[PDB]
Amino acid sequence: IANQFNSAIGKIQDSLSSTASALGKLQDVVNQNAQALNTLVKQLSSNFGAISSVLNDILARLDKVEAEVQIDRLITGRLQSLQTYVTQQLIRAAEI
Amino acid sequence: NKCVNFNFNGLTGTGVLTESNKKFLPFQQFGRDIDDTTDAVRDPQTLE
Amino acid sequence: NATRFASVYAWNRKRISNCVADYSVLYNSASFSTFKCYGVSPTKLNDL
Structure with missing residues (x-):
């Protein structure tokens, strides 16, 4: 009995030395978070209908009224990025 | 090696400016990170 | 101040490059009727 128990422990050590897709449920949570982070990063490169997709590039070229009409947009598009990012994470935090 | 507001040939930012061992090709003037943001620059007065 | 402006059916384009510039000297010119950017x-x- 104790030997067939040790035989199964041995098979597990060989198995974990031989494979990685078995850990695939831990791989899944970190990959969900990896591509979710990657999504939020890509959205700092979106134009959102504004003149330009980068804030400090706008501050290098406009002033006070034709500047803020662009800054409220970047704000809108990014604000939606945060709403959605935190929605996707909150319903995820329920899975975890 | 100090925190500064900067304007490099019209490309502005705020940060610490520090030397680099990453060798740009002769024709390049900006670099870009994974995050698309400007990680590295070549000065227009002195080609470091 | 140049003497002949091109007929627009064949409108003319100057290429300007390799120089410092100033636009204070444009905006503070009395001649201008319109200056939209x-x-x-x-x-x-x-x-x-």
Whole structure:
């Protein structure tokens, strides 16, 4: 009995030395978070209908009224990025 | 090696400016990170 | 101040390059009836 128990422990050590897709449920949570982070990063490169997709590039070229009409947009598009990012994470935090 | 507001040939930012061992090709003037943001620059007065 | 402007059916384009510039000397010119800038506030031409 104790030997067939040790035989199964041995098979597990060989198995974990031989494979990685078995850990695939831990791989899944970190990959969900990896591509979710990657999504939020890509959205700092979106134009959102504004003149330009980068804030400090706008501050290098406009002033006070034709500047803020662009800054409220970047704000809108990014604000939606945060709403959605935190929605996707909150319903995820329920899975975890 | 100090925190500064900067304007490099019209490309502005705020940060610490520090030397680099990453060798740009002769024709390049900006670099870009994974995050698309400007990680590295070549000065227009002195080609470091 | 140049003497002949091109007929618009064949409108003319000057290419300007390799120089410092100033636009304070444009905006503070009394002659102008209209000075609309669409990508850049007219004063900011002097810090770009």
